[PDB]
Design a protein around this ligand. Structure first.
Ligand SMILES: Cc1cn([C@H]2C[C@H](O)[C@@H](COP(=O)(O)OP(=O)(O)O)O2)c(=O)[nH]c1=O
Ligand SMILES: Cc1cn([C@H]2C[C@H](O)[C@@H](COP(=O)(O)OP(=O)(O)O)O2)c(=O)[nH]c1=O
Ligand SMILES: [Cl-]
Ligand SMILES: [Cl-]
Lengths: 203, 203
């Protein structure tokens, strides 16, 4: 049926889901916990499903919950198109500060971002709708951000679209400032958290 | 924030979810497990997220998974409009064969249908998109159906829209035939299953 395959940043995955089309329309399995368990070694669970509507050029991120337990995300653009960027915010990672852009322009493609990574996207179309599943409920005191236009990340956001940032995102610190202030996830700690999820039922 | 309140059929609920609107668009908490736990006494979990696109007049249902563990559903029309009908297929229920129609015409309204109830909807607009969370993964051998146009249910589907049924739904038996063949959930068994979910962690 559908595939799930690792991206260039360890802990980020691309899901391609299958639809069964017929005269009535279509039926799609957008998310399968069984499927994630086979690929990841654990079922991340779904504490919250969030939906955002974004005007064109709106850039949300780079956001992450404090580890642990942080928040894993399964992200899908249900209509319109976004450019999703995953950011390796994890100090000590062999790919720390690296990023990868995935075009999410079809409901049949989903991005999984494990706990401890940074997530962001820009709306490529007016009223782009994004729906994401999170492993952990929202907690304002636990949510953090790095500035998406930080030259230290140097994310290639689309030429020809002016970013529209929230007040919060506009004021966000750069990666270096988050790092020195010890506010970024530690890579070793991320990997240990990953192993811990596999071990809830390794007995 | 958002409300969750019982409908007229015990085990069906209406969720009204809140969005935070701003210049960038909006952010909605479409589903909260914490919220369901407060109302229901248990977190149903999310094994699968399904998405269907339906042409106008398409009627999917009345469907249910064999109890147990059957399948609880959290259903939302993300765009366009459907008329959702919940059916009490549970023999011995004080409201057996009763139904209730909910207009799902806004992404901020969701319907929860606990394990053991029947679910169906008709597309009121062309390409109505429905997204639903299920507590249990899909299993073809476990999925059953009652004919949605059964006069023994007498569901008031919208006047002026011709139903479009799949081959499977077109051929589905009536409620009476499912009943005598012992293929419907038992009400007592439904209630016991409900109590069992509360008790996974009543220790
Ligand atoms: C992330 C999140 C935000 N919110 C609220 C807080 C704000 O009032 C509004 C937007 O928050 P914000 O953090 O700016 O969201 P985004 O990730 O889309 O940039 O939504 C929730 O209610 N729940 C959540 O899980
Ligand atoms: C309910 C369901 C159906 N399917 C498949 C079986 C069929 O080929 C197709 C449509 O099934 P069908 O049972 O007719 O779906 P609906 O509830 O929308 O009437 O989708 C899945 O792959 N997973 C599921 O969870
Ligand atoms: Cl998830
Ligand atoms: Cl559910």
């Amino acid at each position: 049926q559908g595939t799930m395959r690792p991206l260039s940043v360890q802990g980020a995955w691309l899901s391609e889901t299958r639809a069964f089309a017929d005269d009535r329309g279509e039926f799609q399995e957008l998310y399968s916990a069984r499927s994630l368990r086979g690929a990841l070694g654990y079922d991340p669970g779904v504490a919250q499903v969030n939906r955002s509507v974004s005007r064109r050029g709106v850039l949300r991120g780079v956001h992450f919950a404090q580890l642990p337990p942080s928040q894993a995300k399964y992200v899908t653009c249900l209509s319109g198109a976004v450019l999703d960027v995953v950011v390796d915010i994890r100090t000590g990672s062999p790919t720390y500060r690296a990023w990868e852009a995935v075009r999410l322009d079809d409901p049949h493609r989903s991005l999984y971002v494990e706990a401890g990574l940074g997530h962001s996207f820009m709306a490529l179309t007016d009223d782009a709708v994004v729906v994401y599943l999170t492993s952990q409920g929202y907690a304002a005191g636990r949510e953090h951000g790095v500035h998406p236009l930080d030259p230290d990340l140097g994310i290639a956001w689309p030429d020809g679209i002016e970013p529209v940032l929230s007040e919060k995102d506009r004021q966000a610190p750069g990666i270096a400032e988050m790092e020195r202030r010890g506010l970024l996830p530690d890579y070793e700690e991320c990997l240990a958290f990953r192993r811990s999820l596999c071990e809830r039922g390794t007995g």
